[PDB]
From Swiss-Prot, chain A:
This is E3 ubiquitin-protein ligase Mdm2. Changing residue 34 to S: Loss of ubiquitin ligase E3 activity. The gene is MDM2. It comes from the Eukaryota. It comes from Homo sapiens. Changing residue 22 to S: No substantial decrease of ubiquitin ligase E3 activity.
From Swiss-Prot, chain B:
Region I is sufficient for binding TP53 and inhibiting its G1 arrest and apoptosis functions. It also binds TP73. Region II contains most of a central acidic region and a putative C4-type zinc finger. The RING finger domain which coordinates two molecules of zinc mediates the heterooligomerization with MDM2. Interacts with MDM2. Interacts with TP53, TP73 and USP2. Found in a trimeric complex with USP2, MDM2 and MDM4. Interacts (phosphorylated) with YWHAG; negatively regulates MDM4 activity toward TP53. Residues 1-63 are annotated as: Necessary for interaction with USP2. Along with MDM2, contributes to TP53 regulation. Inhibits p53/TP53- and TP73/p73-mediated cell cycle arrest and apoptosis by binding its transcriptional activation domain. Inhibits degradation of MDM2. Can reverse MDM2-targeted degradation of TP53 while maintaining suppression of TP53 transactivation and apoptotic functions. Changing residue 10 to G: Fails to interact with MDM2. Belongs to the MDM2/MDM4 family. This is Protein Mdm4. It is found in: Nucleus. The chain holds residues 428 to 490 of 490 of the full protein. It comes from the Eukaryota. The gene is MDM4.
Length: 64, 63
């Protein structure tokens, strides 16, 4: 009925911004970093730190 | 601060987590569960927030 308490914790990478940089792979997404930091992970051709699957794209996410 | 909205249930069904990201270009709105977002896309509905074509629906996991 609700997401984990982790959701209100800031970007794990910079700790200074919300987790609004969605890491997209297939029909799933890992939300753990801000937009700026998640873009760096893809630029550096790094996999997803959570599931190590390739990063197809980064989506700036709003919650509204 | 947005941010605590992700602790609310899905705005549609009000009984599942907001884990359905509605993607249009390089932005997304996360205000519904995956189930409900999938239904909206199936119905040909636009994004309930910005009224943009729904290009993709993603199930989201927080880490
Ligand atoms: Zn960050
Ligand atoms: Zn992942
Ligand atoms: Zn729902
Ligand atoms: Zn939208």
């Amino acid at each position: 009925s609700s997401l984990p308490l982790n959701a209100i914790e800031p970007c794990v990478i910079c700790q200074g911004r919300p987790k609004n940089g969605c890491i997209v792979h297939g029909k799933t997404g890992h939300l753990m970093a801000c937009f700026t930091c998640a873009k760096k992970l893809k630029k550096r051709n790094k996999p997803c730190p959570v599931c190590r699957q390739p990063i197809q794209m980064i989506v700036l996410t709003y919650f509204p | 601060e947005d941010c605590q909205n992700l602790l609310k249930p899905c705005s549609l069904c009000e009984k599942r987590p907001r884990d359905g990201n509605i993607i249009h270009g390089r932005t997304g709105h996360l205000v519904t569960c995956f189930h409900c977002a999938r239904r909206l896309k199936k119905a040909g509905a636009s994004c309930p927030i910005c009224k943009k074509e729904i290009q993709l629906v993603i199930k989201v996991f927080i880490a």
